[PDB]
Design a protein around this ligand. Structure first.
Ligand code: FES
Ligand code: FES
Ligand SMILES: [Cl-]
Lengths: 164, 160
């Protein structure tokens, strides 16, 4: 397996967007991270299709979180970018072949499917129990409390952006 | 995210090979769930590379598990087919751009990478805590003690 490369970018974007008190265009996000604007926009559009961000149209426009960081799980972002399917999907192979279990006798899920299900559930539990807000709190703890507000200022800056 | 389809087949394979008392001919093993010989060869290459299934040559030849069901975890089989690669790869994007974290302040992993590595490790830990023997016992419990022996007898029977 390989999680989509976009997951890492999308997570970083959600975290910095928490410090932005105005909409932030894609180009500004891309410049912070020194990455292709068109690359980063595709990831932001994934977040937007999943309802986690929205593109403010018109003047002073750009991306905003559509709900508070504390209501955005890592699982939300991963599914938005990498896709909602579980890693393992049972195609009922016990029903194919010359010893096939009749579908009438397959009321319960295959024990193999259930065991893979249990593992998926552990993955989802760990991602669901952590939010953008928790990542922000770890950053404040490790980088200090001025780090993310400083990034946020840089992201929302107007004309001063061109005089560093 | 998505594992290979080989994973479902491979886990079923390891379960039924526990019930076989002789080597299982390639043709019968392929027949069990109607897959082509090419498809079989690929999965058995993977299980062989991971040390889980062995070929025994000769006239009554075939495949056998290399070790008892109790010593084969779901993680062993999943990594045999899908590979051992971490699903989440950190590319140190925090070290890019005009407000880059300097390399000296990147002694520890990025908080984001830590959260993602942690979740992946919970998935691995769950797969590692369950064995092919636990699945065999659950099958015997739910399908009845004759189900798997019936399959193993079918796999090894000399004539068709
Ligand atoms: S029938 Fe799908 S995992 Fe067993
Ligand atoms: S630098 Fe890779 S996840 Fe933050
Ligand atoms: Cl670390």
């Amino acid at each position: 397996m390989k999680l989509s490369g976009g997951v890492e970018w999308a997570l970083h974007c959600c975290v910095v967007l928490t410090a932005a008190s105005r909409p932030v265009p894609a180009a500004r996000l891309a410049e912070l991270h020194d990455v292709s604007p068109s690359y980063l926009a595709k990831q932001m559009q994934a977040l937007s299709r999943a309802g986690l961000v929205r593109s403010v149209q018109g003047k002073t426009g750009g991306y905003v979180l559509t709900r508070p960081a504390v209501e955005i799980t890592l699982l939300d972002v991963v599914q938005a970018v990498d896709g909602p399917d579980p890693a393992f999907v049972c195609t009922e192979i016990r029903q194919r072949g010359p010893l096939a279990t009749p579908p009438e006798k397959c009321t319960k899920a295959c024990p193999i499917a259930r065991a893979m299900g249990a593992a998926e559930a552990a993955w989802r539990a760990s991602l669901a129990a952590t939010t953008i807000a928790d990542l922000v709190a770890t950053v404040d703890d490790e980088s200090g409390p001025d780090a993310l507000p400083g990034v946020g200022a840089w992201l929302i800056e107007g004309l001063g952006h061109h005089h560093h």
